[PDB]
Design a protein around this ligand. Sequence first.
Ligand SMILES: [Cl-]
Length: 342
Amino acid sequence: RESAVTEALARAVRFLEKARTADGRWLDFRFRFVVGDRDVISSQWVTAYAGEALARAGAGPATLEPARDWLMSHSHPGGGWGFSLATPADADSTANVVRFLSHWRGAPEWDAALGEACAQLLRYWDEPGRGFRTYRPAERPGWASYPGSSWCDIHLCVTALAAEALHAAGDPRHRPVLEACARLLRDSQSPEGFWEAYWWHGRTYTTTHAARLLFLLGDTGPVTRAAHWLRGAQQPGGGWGNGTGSEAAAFHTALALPVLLLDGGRARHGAALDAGLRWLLRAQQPDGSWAHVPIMRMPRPEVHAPWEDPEGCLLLPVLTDRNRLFTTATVVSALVDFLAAS
Ligand SMILES: [Cl-]
């Protein structure tokens, strides 16, 4: 029923609203890096991702504007955004900012800010490779984004989101970049129908973003293949895990459902969608959040294909969002997709 889903969405929105600092920040992915004595925690990246999800969920100006304004007043001085101001900037955090700022398209001042944010994202564009590099190689000084590091490779997870971001920003001049990204993703899809990720412990994350990019360009064959793969991956109790064998989790379920909604929604995948939705409804915590599982991997800089050795490739243990803000935002996005479906 639309009602049970509307209620779950409202509870999740409230969870995220209450977690925001007064000055506009959502903080998550706290962890201890290999070098440096104290914890890092994501500000810019998480704030943009949460903000974008809340924008799609129809959160009001009181919720959204402080986060937008915080990002605008807390960009990296060299340009763009990153994990936090204490890290380098990166294409993925910058792409998330672009996608969030796209919600103010049509206001000339925001059109200008959006255009600037896109130009910052394009500093990570590699025309010969047809994709985006997460980190730009910096020759000098303990963050592992130095020349030849796999942290500065073209990454498919980032490429898909960056292309989605440029699509949302709406500038027709970016269409050749979009098309090139889409060609790389089309060429990189597994025969089974998933995509691998660099930064994500699983086959669900790239799949959601790549499928959606190809959907936006009207290239739906890859989408059908992805949805077919997800149909098989669905666990007996109706949730999805990571697509490399893990048990059902909220994050992965929220990544799977949108792809089915792009491949005929209830007219083709009704039973699978209903089971995934019920899984999310039963799993929601009293506070309106969903429980985290380990989702974000940081590979050793010498490892270029972490997907071939998920457990063995790691610089540090696979990261979760201990505040549940990234996981919950992902679920919010999926519920919005549901409520939009016939
Ligand atoms: Cl910061």
